[PDB]
Amino acid sequence: GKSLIQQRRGKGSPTFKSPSHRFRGAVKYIPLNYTQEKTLRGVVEEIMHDPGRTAPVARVKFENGIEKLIIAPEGLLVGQEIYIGPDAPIAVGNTLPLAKIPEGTYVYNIEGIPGDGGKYVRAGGTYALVVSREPDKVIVQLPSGELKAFNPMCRATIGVVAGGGRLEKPLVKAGKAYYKYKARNKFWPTPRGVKMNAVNHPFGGKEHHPGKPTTTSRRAPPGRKVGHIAARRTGRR
RNA sequence: ACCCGAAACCGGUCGAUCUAGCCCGGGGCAGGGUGAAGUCCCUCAACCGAGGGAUGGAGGCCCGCUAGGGGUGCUGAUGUGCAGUUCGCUCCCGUGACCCCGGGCUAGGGGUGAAAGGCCAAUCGAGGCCGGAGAUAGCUGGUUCCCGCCGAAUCAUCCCGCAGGAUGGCCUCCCCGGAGGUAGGCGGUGGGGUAGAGCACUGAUUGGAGGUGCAGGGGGCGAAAGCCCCCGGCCUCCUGU
RNA sequence: CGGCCGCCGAGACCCCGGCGCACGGACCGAUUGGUCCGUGAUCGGGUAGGCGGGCGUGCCGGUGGCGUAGAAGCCGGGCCGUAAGGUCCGGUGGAGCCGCCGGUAUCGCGGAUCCUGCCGGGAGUAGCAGCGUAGUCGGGUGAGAAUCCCGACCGCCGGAGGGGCCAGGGUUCCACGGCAAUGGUCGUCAGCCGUGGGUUAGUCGGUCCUAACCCCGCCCGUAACUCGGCGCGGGGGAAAGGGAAACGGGUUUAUAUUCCCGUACCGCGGGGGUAGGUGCGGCAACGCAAGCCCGGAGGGUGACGCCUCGGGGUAGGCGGACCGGCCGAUGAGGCCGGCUAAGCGUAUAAGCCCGGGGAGUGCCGUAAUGGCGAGAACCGGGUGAAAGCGCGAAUGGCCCCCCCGUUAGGGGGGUUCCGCCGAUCCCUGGGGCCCGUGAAAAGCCCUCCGGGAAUUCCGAUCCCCCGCGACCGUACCGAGAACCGACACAGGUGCCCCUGGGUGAGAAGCCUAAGGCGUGUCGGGGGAAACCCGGCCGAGGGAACUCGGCAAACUGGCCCCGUAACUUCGGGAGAAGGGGUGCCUGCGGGUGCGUAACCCGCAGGUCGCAGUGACUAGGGGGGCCCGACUGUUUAAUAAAAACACAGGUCCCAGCUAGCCCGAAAGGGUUUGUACUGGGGCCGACGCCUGCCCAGUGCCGGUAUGUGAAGCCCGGGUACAACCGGGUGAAGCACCGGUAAACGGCGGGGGUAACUAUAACCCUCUUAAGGUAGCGAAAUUCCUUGUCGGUUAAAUGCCGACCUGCAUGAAUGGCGUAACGAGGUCCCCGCUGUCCCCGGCCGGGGCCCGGCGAAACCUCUGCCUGGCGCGCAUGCCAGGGACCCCCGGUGGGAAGCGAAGACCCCAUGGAGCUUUACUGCAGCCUGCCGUUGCCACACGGCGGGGGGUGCGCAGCGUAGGCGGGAGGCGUCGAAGCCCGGCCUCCGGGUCGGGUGGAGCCGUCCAUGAGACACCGCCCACUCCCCGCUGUGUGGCUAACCCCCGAAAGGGGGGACAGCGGUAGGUGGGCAGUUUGGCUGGGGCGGCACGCCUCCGAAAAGGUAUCGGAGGCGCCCUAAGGUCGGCUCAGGCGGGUCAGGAAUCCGCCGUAGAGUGCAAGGGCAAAAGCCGGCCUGACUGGACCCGUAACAGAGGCGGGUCCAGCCCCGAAAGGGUGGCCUAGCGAACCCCUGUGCCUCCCCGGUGGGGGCCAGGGAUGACAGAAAAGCUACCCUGGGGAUAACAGAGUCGUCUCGGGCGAGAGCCCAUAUCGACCCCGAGGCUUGCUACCUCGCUGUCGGCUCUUCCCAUCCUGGCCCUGCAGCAGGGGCCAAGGGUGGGGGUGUUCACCCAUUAAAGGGGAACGUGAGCUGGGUUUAGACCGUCGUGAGACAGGUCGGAUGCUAUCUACCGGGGGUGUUGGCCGCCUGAGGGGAAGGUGCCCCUAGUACGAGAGGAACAGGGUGCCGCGGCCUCUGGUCUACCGG
RNA sequence: AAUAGGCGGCCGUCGAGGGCUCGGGUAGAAGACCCGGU
């Protein structure tokens, strides 16, 4: 048989590679040595549209002379001042350790471990809810609905990511979809395994139906995991 | 291993000037129409409202031999062509998912695919070049001077055997051994169950006569113990197979 | 037909002569032999094949020779040899060659669709047309001119055939000298040949920067590398991105932004001054020369998308005036020239600012959006582009005039204004859009920070002057001849960048200026045809054509009225439909200063057939199916209903995740983080999406069973191997969820008979029985279902019903506006599609002069009937034909372009699928190592100790056996009391104390007796020590992950990762298998291993998918022996007792029985009944059968020897079943037995060997093993199917014999049962004889011909024939046998006419004649079947038709010979051809014959239509590229 | 028409008759055919 699209994506060819040269750059926090035990004040210079981010970006210049790129929270104003550190006030756009953030607050850009630079709640329109604070861990409810425990020293930014409601308007046109997916080099348009040939897909065949149940085992080898992978259930409930 | 021919398999290499996809940087698309959002104006009334007039340039919008791109029908010309896919008329898109160019990347069980098993240099249900390699076949074709002597077979058993082999039968050449041999006929000693014929067994087969109540059936007939016939069955004989 | 006579006729038979062969004999050879004689009626064909001899070729060892007085070789002849061949003669040739003996070898050719080279017929033929049809006249050159050169005329392109210039080409560029070859002809010409030349840069480009991306070093992986890779350091990477600087005139045969002249600019360095160091004007925006050098930082610029509009400007264009020139008539008018580069200096517009000012019952402004106390009107100013203006620059260029003109030259004039339009070319601002955000760096400018030098000094971005500026490209084409495609290729690259006037909206079409060309290169002739390609027209009809309106035709621009169903309210829509359109004269209006330019109206006059007059330029409407739309696809037969799409919904994943690449290292998603990344399915929109978890999947659990290695325990082994048990993860077993997961959603009877028929209803049945919708459907076989509409006529289309073979709800159901080169039906209009074809034009065809092939070719080439491998130009018998050439049409050569589309075979392949076989990755998991430290719990071990033992009986709560009736007691005991304790709360054990001297049987009970004492245990449990693991909790120090250059910090953590091993899962990836026979193959069956009867033909043998049946066991008796008896059936007689229970007598040849089929054999037995036994045994020999003759592994059977036995008195018998079926190699393993053996020797454990028995291969003389191919490939097969031929005729079509009868009587007017005999090859089938290195299918169109079994026309006979008509039959093949509807249809059905509207053959006639609707590839949909790939003689949409005629054939046209010398003219007609004619109707006979009436003929006599044929242009119509007019 | 014909006329034992060339169609693909040519 022939390879699948997922199999061909793992080889890193330009058909599947992300065009990470037209983007504004990675959004990570300043190194943790600056933030620990000290509070830094920065000024917002500009708010721009990152080609592939699903969220606006902002440029922040700090008093020590460091220029950084951050994910702009909703309501962030050009020329406003922000603070990062343990002593930062509780306001939108300020970054604090999770131990100093009061319960019931909305946060985003949470570090998985202290100093990694931020890994969670980064998409546009997303926020997480601080639930409980303990000397050993801090519980936050993530956008997926899961309650996750983080180290008290993990950093997060107060507010909600700008760009929410993006899915309220339909894409309408295949041309609109074409531009949207070409901006980030995502495989588009997409074919169907049932209309593929038998050599190409497990579901391929002259008759456009799957010849086997579409729920595939978690232990299936690569080149076989298609359809519903390790599905607990199917259908509409 | 007498000689030539396979489709195919395997190794290492060569190709994205064709074409497919994606990235960086560039060039291009006469003229006309329609009239979305938006911004309004005027009149009569005023508790409602009704009517009229503008501006505005959006669209995978419309007409279009602009350029450029595509290829529906004629199943037209040509069909040892101008051309190893071209020409004419007709037709379709023509501001967009648009067309084209220079620089790059993805390489063969791999790439790429708006998915036709399409495209990857006139080659694609696994590219090309050299090597394994003079590959293999029970299948097709071929196999070069003359005279002389003898001269077949397509029948039995076995094989994943049925277009192929092996053991025998039938042919030919040479040698040992040394007195019998038998294709034809006559007479004799034995064996046989075919043709024909026949009913003595086994099984069929038309009618009639006699015997047998014979566990049969049909009627009449009787409290009930059984009778009277017809038919049927079973034997013998005659008759026709 | 019954006989005879004579002849003729083979290689047969006879005779003479010759050869060889086989055998025997004599004689003679220094290697197979030679000569001669004898016999051959009993020797003489020959494929496969065997054997013997001989001929020829190259070279070696010998031997004997030839040759320049002519070797080899070659050409024509003579002789010899059966022959393969040898040798001579004549000629050419000029240098080597041969006989014999013995060796040796790339040793002998007609084939292999053989290889290489050369040459024929096709052929002096095709081609030199189609998309741009271009030449003519006079002159010149030259041996030579359609083709070369000049002038004139006539033409083509003119948003490209013109101008510029990349890539590519590499000298093709220029001049001179030429035509052997090249150039589609010629050539004096050339992109050709020869000889000489040609490319000049500080400013143009490379060079510099960086983008996507690439390379090198370190590092890591790999057995390793030239292989893979993250991170660090370095470098490269654009001749169209960024990026210092030049523009006119002139010059050469060929270079010029490069050379010369003129005028400039840029970078570096230097010299002399100056500004500044130490300076001013403005409130301000700002104006300014506004210090030098080194280092750093900041800002700006470089620096950016798409759509759209306003403003300013420039090229270019138009009109007018004026001066020169040309034309015109020295009229009017038209045409030509009237030009201005960089650089330097110079400023406004928009935009943005800066002062003053202080508004709203609001003012201000734009094309538009808009702005204002967060500061508007309004008055001043600052900065700020493209341009214009001045110098450059009129000594230059352009135009004109004059003198000299033999060559060569010299001078004089002008080059000026106004108005309008105006870019796609520049500058500058608004506005709008993004789920889309549309590059970086070098470089340059400014500002700011530190540092350095400067006072009789430092010193510029300002002025003047001077010097230097490297390397490489530069010619030419740039394409219908300079590139790629083999080409001077109609393709592609590059149309990549640019465009005067008129008409016109237009970069449209047409004409035309400039520029270019006549080289999209063979010319000439012609009523010079037929026919083909391209174009124009066509009377009357108007789709009657056809699968289908294919093609063509109608409409057409603009203005004004007007515009439907439906709808997603946007659309449909230019729906539909109607009116007008030219020219001239004159007015009015809009913007405008304008009587400049553009645009919009009005009135009148007038001409034609026609006024968007050419050119340009929609035909329209109504239903249905499918897909929402724009878009994409099989480059080269399918553009679609297929794919994509926005939208819906489901699944996985919190990041060291999920999914994926890899051998690993590392990596893609990822500069990402659930509004995200990845994985399915449906597919806009509207309404909806029902039931089922039994099956197959997936997910969770897993108490319990199984479950590998490892570990532990016992046995074994002087140690192991080996055996048994325990622990035992994952996975299965099991349980639960899950269907927008794969799929499924049934089946019988009767009813409610206010008829009949329906579901209310009761019985099996599953996980459940299909809900809403839709339905003869792209799904319906019957089917052309039935009804209604459409037509004269309907296999169509639409509406409806439901009997849904085999619809149905996200493999979605139904509906749907808009959309579509999708399929489909109808209507108006239109037309040469058709009736029915006829004219005209241009190019071919044809002839003449040139260049000049190819496909193909065994040799040839006439027919009828035949034989034949079954459809012959060549054979047999006949018929006919003198020979050659030109033009044409394609019947045949099963013509040419191919080692068969289709089918079968091959122990041949490839792609794909799966619960086929066997494997490899990935994934899950146990164990060992990395791997450490604190505790807790649990499960097993060793050392000890505890309480805890109701079987039934009892003083009593005996568990087991042993010694053992006494043992205990100050070595302190009963009977009293409370405490803890286990406990079947039965009832026992025990600390303390009142207590100070007794307690149990032994005896009997108890299936087994002592709480008499002494011992070992067994059943549960706990605890003290040590060992062992499993799980749980915690820790950091290994290890990992993050931040950081590092230091170090943080997070996880003995997990994970890595290494080794063990089990599972695993079409993700591979190698394979999927048998054979077969009246093709498949399905079926097993004729695939055995036994019996028939076939089978009286010895033996004998086959078929021949006929009739059995076997894959069973029996300790159904085996051995001995003794005794006689069976089945029937008759007669008997208590219950009968048809049948038991008994007596007789007949009784087996009619019974013998285990099981059939055949054979069995009567004092081989049957039945009894006694005794195991010979169904051990060691061996020979023989028969499977398998004749005639080969055999294995197996079966028979005759015996010996041992030990059985029965019998003995003889005698017994090696299974009375005989013929009931079964199986190698290797391996198990068992019995008693011997041999294992590497220097010996012992032990273990292994190997010899003999016997057993476990099975049924495809049974012994592989381990599923499918699709329509994407298919290869080698083959007429050993083998489909089409066609051949054989046959069951079947089909058509007859005949007899006569039961039916016909009022009457068999035969007509029909003719039941039976019987035939003909044809027109239906189908059967066989498999020709054809698989290809013979192209059905239907239709065109065209020719034949048969009669006659539909009509001609003539007759019978009749249940009155007439008109009918029914049946006979002769007769000259003629006719037509037009339409649905359907691909043949056929069949239907419609209106007709004399009738016949059936058949010709390779189911006819594709080198056509068409391509069906069938039968590759794409796609629906239904059904299959787990799946997929399949369906089931529907449905699309899906290629090649040709230069060699021979013959036919149609026409010519040159010759012959016809006993040549020529002209007129005739004859032997033979051949014809249909040259065929057939309706009307009047009259006649309302007559006939007939009751109704009705209704015929002979004869007249007229006329249609079909067919042969002619003609007076009449009519068509055309009329002569001609005339608008 | 292989029995390959009949008749009238002109010619031979220099010469009747004909062809090319010429002007044109009652004809035509080349050939052929038909009229005219002092």
Curated annotation (Swiss-Prot):
The cross-references to Pfam families, in alphabetical order and at most eight, read:
Ribosomal_L2, Ribosomal_L2_C
For this record, the Gene Ontology CC terms, alphabetical, are: cytosolic large ribosomal subunit
What superkingdom heads the lineage?
Archaea
Q: Where is this region: Disordered?
A: 1-20, 202-237
- Record's keyword terms, sorted: Ribonucleoprotein, Ribosomal protein, RNA-binding, rRNA-binding
**Molecular function, one GO term:** structural constituent of ribosome
Composition bias type Basic residues, residue spans: 221-237
UniProt-listed GO biological process terms: cytoplasmic translation
Family assignment from sequence similarity = Belongs to the universal ribosomal protein uL2 family.
Instruction: Explain the purpose of this protein.
Output: One of the primary rRNA binding proteins. Required for association of the 30S and 50S subunits to form the 70S ribosome, for tRNA binding and peptide bond formation. It has been suggested to have peptidyltransferase activity; this is somewhat controversial. Makes several contacts with the 16S rRNA in the 70S ribosome.
| Oligomer status and interactors | Part of the 50S ribosomal subunit. Forms a bridge to the 30S subunit in the 70S ribosome.
Would you tell me the protein name for this molecule?
A: Large ribosomal subunit protein uL2
Phylogenetic classification of the source organism: Archaea, Methanobacteriati, Methanobacteriota, Thermococci, Thermococcales
Q: What gene name is given for the protein in this entry? A: rpl2
